[PDB]
Amino acid sequence: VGSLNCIVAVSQNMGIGKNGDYPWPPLRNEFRYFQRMTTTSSVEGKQNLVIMGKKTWFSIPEKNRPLKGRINLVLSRELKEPPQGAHFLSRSLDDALKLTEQPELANKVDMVWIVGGSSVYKEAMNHPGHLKLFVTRIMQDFESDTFFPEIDLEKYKLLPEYPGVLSDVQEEKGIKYKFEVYEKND
Numbered sequence: 001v002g003s004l005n006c007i008v009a010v011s012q013n014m015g016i017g018k019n020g021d022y023p024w025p026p027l028r029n030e031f032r033y034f035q036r037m038t039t040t041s042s043v044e045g046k047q048n049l050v051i052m053g054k055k056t057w058f059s060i061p062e063k064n065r066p067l068k069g070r071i072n073l074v075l076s077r078e079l080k081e082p083p084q085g086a087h088f089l090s091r092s093l094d095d096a097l098k099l100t101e102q103p104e105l106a107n108k109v110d111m112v113w114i115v116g117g118s119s120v121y122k123e124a125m126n127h128p129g130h131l132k133l134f135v136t137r138i139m140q141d142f143e144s145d146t147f148f149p150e151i152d153l154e155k156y157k158l159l160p161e162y163p164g165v166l167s168d169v170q171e172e173k174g175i176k177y178k179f180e181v182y183e184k185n186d
């Protein structure tokens, strides 16, 4: 019960993963940016909630699990309890959001960040209400086996700027990328 946002890093051909990992070499400032966006809460004494499907939870290195300073929720219909290190397990995105409204969490969470994977995004994308997409455009093609859903530009507007988000083209390990913010309201 705060903002609902999706954050993703996409190659030119819309890939986000390849054999359980992201397709390019590690980009430390892309990770630094992902960490600060998802960890920074807007209010005082609140923490943001991160929602992720199971394959995404297992692609984070064990040392980095759970993602520090955030409430980590995993989506799965197969698991019986949250994986080791996870704070909550939900069977569906609606239940994950119905949970935020439990007195439990109702007072602790600021923003909800959808961090993947593809089915998770596809659904938050069609979910109604106000939604922002924070897209990292990796400007090169990468062999992938999982993709980000098509952004409908009649519903999503690309913003010209956003506070805290660099506007220039970045480059790291010879890969250029840029940060984009899209907003919907329906």
Ligand SMILES: NC(=O)C1=CN([C@@H]2O[C@H](COP(=O)(O)OP(=O)(O)OC[C@H]3O[C@@H](n4cnc5c(N)ncnc54)[C@H](OP(=O)(O)O)[C@@H]3O)[C@@H](O)[C@H]2O)C=CC1
Pocket (backbone or CB within 6 Å): 007, 008, 009, 010, 015, 016, 017, 018, 019, 020, 021, 022, 052, 053, 054, 055, 056, 057, 059, 075, 076, 077, 078, 079, 090, 091, 092, 093, 115, 116, 117, 118, 119, 120, 123, 146
């Ligand atoms: N570049 C980037 O930004 C990102 C890259 N990644 C990478 O992308 C790929 C992750 O892949 P993807 O296959 O899309 O995986 P998810 O992380 O979406 O895992 C899919 C599993 O999560 C559960 N799940 C997914 N959607 C839901 C739902 N709506 N309700 C309940 N359970 C759900 C199901 O678990 P079950 O079968 O147990 O029911 C499903 O088998 C990896 O390669 C990862 O490293 C991931 C995130 C962002």
Ligand SMILES: CN(Cc1cnc2nc(N)nc(N)c2n1)c1ccc(C(=O)N[C@@H](CCC(=O)O)C(=O)O)cc1
Pocket (backbone or CB within 6 Å): 007, 008, 009, 021, 022, 028, 030, 031, 032, 034, 035, 056, 059, 060, 061, 064, 067, 068, 114, 115, 116, 136
């Ligand atoms: C598999 N993967 C998914 C992944 C990677 N890049 C992304 N980039 C963005 N922009 N959006 C995403 N949703 C995203 N997700 C991972 C892998 C590692 C960590 C992770 O270790 N993150 C640390 C960052 C520490 C660091 O490398 O600086 C954290 O505290 O956020 C996160 C996501």
